[PDB]
Amino acid sequence: QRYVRKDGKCNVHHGNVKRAETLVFSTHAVISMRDGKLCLMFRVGDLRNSHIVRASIRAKLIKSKQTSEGEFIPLNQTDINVGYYTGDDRLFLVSPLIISHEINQQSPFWEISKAQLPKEELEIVVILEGMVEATGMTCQARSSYITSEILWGYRFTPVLTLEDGFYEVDYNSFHETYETSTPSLSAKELAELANRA
Amino acid sequence: QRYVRKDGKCNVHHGNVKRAETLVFSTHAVISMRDGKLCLMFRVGDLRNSHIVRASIRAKLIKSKQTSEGEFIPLNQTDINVGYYTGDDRLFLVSPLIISHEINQQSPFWEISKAQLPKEELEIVVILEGMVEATGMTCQARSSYITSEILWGYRFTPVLTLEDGFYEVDYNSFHETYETSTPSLSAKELAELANRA
Amino acid sequence: QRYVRKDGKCNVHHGNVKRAETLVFSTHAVISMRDGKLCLMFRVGDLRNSHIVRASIRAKLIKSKQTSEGEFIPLNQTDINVGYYTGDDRLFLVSPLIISHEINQQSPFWEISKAQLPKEELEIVVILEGMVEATGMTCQARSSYITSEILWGYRFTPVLTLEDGFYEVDYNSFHETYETSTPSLSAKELAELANRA
Amino acid sequence: QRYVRKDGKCNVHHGNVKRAETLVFSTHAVISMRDGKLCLMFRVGDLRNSHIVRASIRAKLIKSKQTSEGEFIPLNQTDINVGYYTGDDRLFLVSPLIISHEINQQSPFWEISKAQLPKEELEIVVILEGMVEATGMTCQARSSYITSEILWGYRFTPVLTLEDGFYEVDYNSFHETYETSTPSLSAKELAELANRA
Ligand SMILES: [Mg+2]
């Protein structure tokens, strides 16, 4: 049962679809484990009634900082890895996608535990760029996740199923998350413990 | 006998050319050895009566997976390497090109043998992006290869020859493949065996 | 107090705003320490009355050189790293940003000390590229810093504060710098000394 | 004496300027030493009466090959490194630039000596892409160097001088080359010999 037909069209139905511009980014982001790595995740959706093409996702952490020399930098900006090194930030965006940032040694979240998170003053800006297919007109969409909108120990509720030849997207579940057993340690300490043996 | 003239034009004739939109991607993909590496290959063609410019190729594996923590991800998407790291995904596309994905340790096909392949539930989406030369208008074309459309132990029939000052493309051979002696081991086991001595 | 609203708009006020085209690049660049690394920095601003989108920054060192084989290359051009490897050269440009080039072993400034700098015959060209949001029309802006416009031992005066729900930009401070305690050694010798113990 | 003014304009005069479209690529390419590395070089020029913006250069080697398994690939295409890894392929193109490909272990020219070169059946396609500044209209220009158009032991004659506040480009020298003392060994053997001691 193919997703993409030989003629370039998709066997996808967008069901239970709400203002279009509220189905671009999930209201919340989540942190939980995937294949042994702690990941920060958010969901992104296509434009309704118009497919987005040449799509790419980027993310910036905005967070005040002070250098060791004492320079205060208000709302310092730094790039959050969501696939730039591998080309995974170039999206094939038909049905909604969970974008995943692996919290590793290069992530600004490396040292942040479940207990520490709500004490942080931070904001993740997410930026989706691309082009309207039918128009060749460029577009950008943006949103953000402040500290309280990042849910530790949660995954996204899946939205995609296969029904009678159509891959069905239930947009009623676009924004929904559920709790799952998750460590409360920071990624750094989780790794250190795995490395012991 | 040059392919590209000093004036920027090409000495190429597009022969035996069929609906234009059926000569963008080969109907099938193939797996066989090239210079000691197992490769997954598909063929791509230019637009007829209009040269494509700023051309680039990308490929995504669509395949359901479950994380070790038990999260089911329907039709999980991951990028397949077709030249991003070297710039080889930026095409000079006049006569048809065989795009090659080397099956190495980072390839999602690394552990898949000839016997295992038909048991896999997967789909490779291929995406060609660029711009119509005469119009400066952007374009995208897409297709896909499901499991049964990937032929293990085959190469593409060449289409290009030199005839009286013209490089001749025989589009009668665009889609044709032929069988060739190929190992049935997975790339992983082929490598392990080469590494022994 | 969020910078970016869920609706994609920003809580930023551009205050005390002067010809728009004089608030694109700081008149001067500076060199000083950040978290133990010597950095060359310059400030960039958005377009007034029109937000710039898909923004990116690049920088070129223009400087005559002679190869060891004796070839003189007038105004040889080489790229200066301002984020290409990490994606940090892709800007989210609303309030003004300090662009930072870390002076490391790959920087053309690696061996240049405070005393040597004014003896150098060089020019840093800075190039901001992007697209006007409301128009989808592309744009480029350029400027440069000759030797005397690079200030060793200085930082930029911050411009951003939080006032009554708005992040306030004081463009009166866009161009201003202040002196700060800074080593006069070249980055190379600073590193060598840190490496001793 | 600055090249780029604070207002973004350049202090460059394009002198002794011929059909515009013949001053895009040098008729020939050259091979000679630069700072101990053997380099393949060609010259590129801006469009006359219209500055090119967002400019980038790429290069492809076209050369038939046979795999060790016996597959013949007519006019196989592979990317030639002219700055992709560092961003040096993104040009600031006002006065003509010498594009340099370092012949290292990853270059398809690594094993080719002065005596071997004329025996090779090959063609380097060069592709300049960008946008007309005044129009925001995209453009591409292409040319190529066959075997006999690659001159071993030559450099380009410089074109740029400083005269009364203007950097002067002498387009009479755009295409001219001169002979210089150069090793005749392949880059590979040159390196091996340097490595001995
Ligand atoms: Mg890149």
In SS3 terms, chain C reads as CCCECCCCCECEEEECCCCHHHCCECCCEEEEEECCEEEEEEEECCCCCCCEEEEEEEEEEEEEEECCCCCEEEEEEEEECCCCCCCCCEECCCCCEEEEEECCCCCCCCCCCCCCHHHCCCEEEEEEEEEECCCCCEEEEEEEEEHHHEEECEEECCCEEEECCEEEEEHHHCCCEEECCCCCCCHHHHHHHHHCC
Kindly report the nearest CA distance between residue D167 and chain C, in angstroms: 10
One-letter amino acid for residue D76 of the chain: N
Whether D125 sits inside 8 A of B167 (CB atoms) is no
Contacts of A4 in chain B (CB under 8 A): 123, 125, 142-144
Contacts of A72 in chain C (CB under 8 A): 158
For D192, residues 6+ apart whose C-beta sits below 8 A from its C-beta are none
Touch criterion met for D and A (3+ Cβ pairs within 8 Å): no
| Interval between CA A82 and ligand 1 midpoint (Å) | 14
Touch criterion met for B and D (3+ Cβ pairs within 8 Å): yes
| Interval between CA A86 and ligand 1 midpoint (Å) | 9
- Among D83, D84, D58, D18, smallest CA distance to D144 is for D58
CA distance C40 to C58: 13
From residue C36, give the alpha-carbon distance in Å to each of A68, C102, C104.
7, 10, 11
| Interval between CA A69 and ligand 1 midpoint (Å) | 33
| Interval between CA C179 and ligand 1 midpoint (Å) | 37
CA distance A19 to C48: 30
One-letter amino acid for residue C113 of the chain: S
Cα-atom radius of gyration of chain B, to the nearest Å?
18
For C33, residues 6+ apart whose C-beta sits below 8 A from its C-beta are A67, A69, C39, C182, C183
Whether A27 sits inside 8 A of C4 (CB atoms) is no
Name the residue in chain D with its Cα closest to that of C84.
D87
Please tell me what resolution, in angstroms, this structure has: 2.0
- Among C31, C155, B66, C10, smallest CA distance to A158 is for B66
**Chains A, B: CB pairs < 8 Å:** 70
A172: which 2 tokens? Answer: 């009623």
Whether B54 sits inside 8 A of D146 (CB atoms) is no
For C96, residues 6+ apart whose C-beta sits below 8 A from its C-beta are C23, C43, C44, C45, C46, C159, C160, C169, C171, C174
| Interval between CA B40 and ligand 1 midpoint (Å) | 23
Whether A8 sits inside 8 A of B62 (CB atoms) is no
Name the residue in chain C with its Cα closest to that of D38.
C69
Kindly report the nearest CA distance between residue C34 and chain A, in angstroms: 6
Q: Can you give the residue range of the structural domain that contains A39?
A: 1-197
Question: Which of A57, A125, A137 is best to mutate for the C interface (most C CBs within 10 A)?
Answer: A125
| Interval between CA B130 and ligand 1 midpoint (Å) | 17
Residue B70, SS3?
coil
Name the residue in chain C with its Cα closest to that of A72.
C158
Whether A58 sits inside 8 A of C95 (CB atoms) is no
Whether B79 sits inside 8 A of A90 (CB atoms) is yes
Name the residue in chain C with its Cα closest to that of A79.
C88
Please report, for the domain that includes residue B36, its CATH number.
2.60.40.1400
Question: Which of C1, C2, C139 is best to mutate for the A interface (most A CBs within 10 A)?
Answer: C2
- All chains having 3 or more CB pairs closer than 8 angstroms to chain C: A, D
Specify burial of residue D133 (Cβ count, 10 A radius: 0-12, 13-18, 19+).
middle
Token pair 């040694």 is found at A105
Contacts of B142 in chain A (CB under 8 A): 4, 8
Contacts of B57 in chain A (CB under 8 A): none
Name the residue in chain C with its Cα closest to that of A122.
C2
D135: which 2 tokens? Answer: 């129009």
Largest CA distance in chain D: 63
For B117, residues 6+ apart whose C-beta sits below 8 A from its C-beta are B31, B147, B150, B152
Kindly report the nearest CA distance between residue C3 and chain D, in angstroms: 30
D92-130: b (≥16 Cβ within 10 Å) or e:
bbbbbbbbbbbbeeebbbeebbeeebeeeebbbbbbbbb
Q: How many domains does chain D have?
A: 1
